[PDB]
Structures are given as structure tokens and as C-alpha cells.
């Protein structure tokens, strides 16, 4: 992701 935080795609 460019500008989000999270888990692996």
C-alpha cells in the first residue's frame, strides 16, 4: 500500500 498501514496483501 502507498499510504495505508496493515497486513500482507
Amino acid at each position, epitope marked *: *500500500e*502507498p*499510504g*495505508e*498501514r*496493515g*497486513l*500482507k*496483501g
Partner: antibody, heavy 119, light 109 residues
Framework: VQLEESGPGLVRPSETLSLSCTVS?????????WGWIRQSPGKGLEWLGS???????YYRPSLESRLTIAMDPSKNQVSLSLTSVTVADSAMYYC?????????????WGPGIVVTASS | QSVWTQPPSVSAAPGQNVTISCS????????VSWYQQVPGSAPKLVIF???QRPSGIPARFSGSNSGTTATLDIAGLQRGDEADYYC???????????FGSGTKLTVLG
């Protein structure tokens, strides 16, 4: 790429903790989150939250309602505001540059600033 | 979990190999990072995206992230390796960035 924390070393319980971080030798224009970690004396690291230049902001849920992390790219600064401080908020506070998405790595770190919360 | 589980203490003579664990399979779901802290300095990134080393971090530092336990592996242990090591990873369940409990690595003198 040097991050530097600045602000008061002593804060009074019930008042607001306000820290500032200056960024040198890197534009804040770029695809990075800027954030804050704290560490109580001989306890662990605790992620407070982070912000990107698009205004998106992530927070520790249990502190989310007391926490304000803001950045101004033009000043090369990132701010932290923590309201209603208690004796529990005594910590070293560190500014971090964060790669976002799935990665979530923190590099570099600022030297840190000691904050004592007492009346 | 709100804090990842790490052993509080790991220790070995200079030259030995050591493993530091970080604990459903929610770890396999995110990229694990590892941080070295010596007293009176800020944490330093030592492993990112499970496995990768930033610049200046020699090859005897490596990391794995299988389901249940992400590891930090150090071969050829040196006195200068003596520090607190913290794993870190996103918990999409809590939707927060979580650190581990921290491990003190002692190089036995």
C-alpha cells in the same frame, strides 16, 4: 536523515504533553509515515500512532481518544499532543520514520526525550 | 495479542549461535521487524520484511516468519551484540502496531 525530539522534560498530571520532532536531510513529501514510540523505565516499546502527508492517522486504540499526531511538511516537523496526562505517561518518547503498507519498519529513530509526569 | 511474546533472557558464549522467538498464525500475516537497543541509545532497525537486513547489518543476522514463531537468528555471537531485541508487527485484529515483550541477549563473560 536525523530526527530530533524537543519539548518539556516535566509535565503536570491532568495537563497536556506536547512534543515536537524536526526532520533534517529528507523531504516529508515522500511515501513515509512519521510517528511516536514511548518506553517507560525498564518496560518495553509502545507504539502511540503515526501520520502520512495525506492526513491519514493511526493510533493505539486504548489511547486513541487522548492522542493527536500531526505533521507540517513545510516546517519539516511532526507534533505529538497527549491530553489528560497521568503519572503512567512518564517515558522516553521517540520520533520515528516508518515505511507503511504491509512492511511497518521504523528507521531511523531520534535520540529520544525523557518526560517525567509528576505534580 | 497487544504485546508479542518473546523470552525475557537468551545467552551464549562469544562465537555461539542464538535464536530469539516472537509469538494464532497472525504473525505470518504481517512483515516482522526486529530492533536492537543498548542502554542510553534509541532502538536501531536490524531486520525488516521478515528476512532483509538494512545497510551495515552483517550476514550473521537473519530472520524467519513461519506461522506461529518469527525468529531473529545471530551466528558468530559478539560482545557488541549484547542488547535488548524487540520484534514488532501489525495486528490487523487490534489494528495497531505491536512490539514484543523484548529479549535481553547476554554474551556470557
Amino acid at each position: 536523515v536525523q530526527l530530533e525530539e524537543s519539548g518539556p522534560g516535566l509535565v503536570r498530571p491532568s495537563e497536556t504533553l506536547s512534543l515536537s520532532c524536526t526532520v533534517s536531510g529528507f523531504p516529508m513529501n515522500e511515501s513515509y509515515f512519521w510517528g511516536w514510540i514511548r518506553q517507560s523505565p525498564g518496560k518495553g516499546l509502545e507504539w502511540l500512532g503515526s501520520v502520512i502527508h495525506t492526513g491519514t492517522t493511526y493510533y493505539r486504540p486504548s489511547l486513541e481518544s487522548r492522542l493527536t499526531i500531526a505533521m507540517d511538511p513545510s516546517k519539516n516537523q511532526v507534533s505529538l499532543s497527549l491530553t489528560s496526562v497521568t503519572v503512567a505517561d512518564s517515558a522516553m518518547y521517540y520520533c520515528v520514520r516508518i515505511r507503511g503498507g504491509s512492511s511497518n519498519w521504523l528507521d531511523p529513530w531520534g535520540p529520544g526525550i525523557v518526560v517525567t509526569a509528576s505534580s | 495479542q497487544s504485546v508479542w511474546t518473546q523470552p525475557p533472557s537468551v545467552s551464549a558464549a562469544p562465537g555461539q549461535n542464538v535464536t530469539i522467538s516472537c509469538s494464532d498464525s497472525i504473525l505470518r500475516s504481517a512483515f516482522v521487524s526486529w530492533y536492537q537497543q543498548v542502554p542510553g541509545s534509541a532502538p536501531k532497525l536490524v531486520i525488516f520484511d521478515d528476512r532483509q537486513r538494512p545497510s551495515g547489518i552483517p550476514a550473521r543476522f537473519s530472520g524467519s516468519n513461519s506461522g506461529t514463531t518469527a525468529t531473529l537468528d545471530i551466528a558468530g555471537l559478539q560482545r557488541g551484540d549484547e542488547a535488548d531485541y524487540y520484534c514488532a508487527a501489525w495486528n490487523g485484529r487490534l489494528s495497531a502496531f505491536v512490539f514484543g515483550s523484548g529479549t535481553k541477549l547476554t554474551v556470557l563473560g
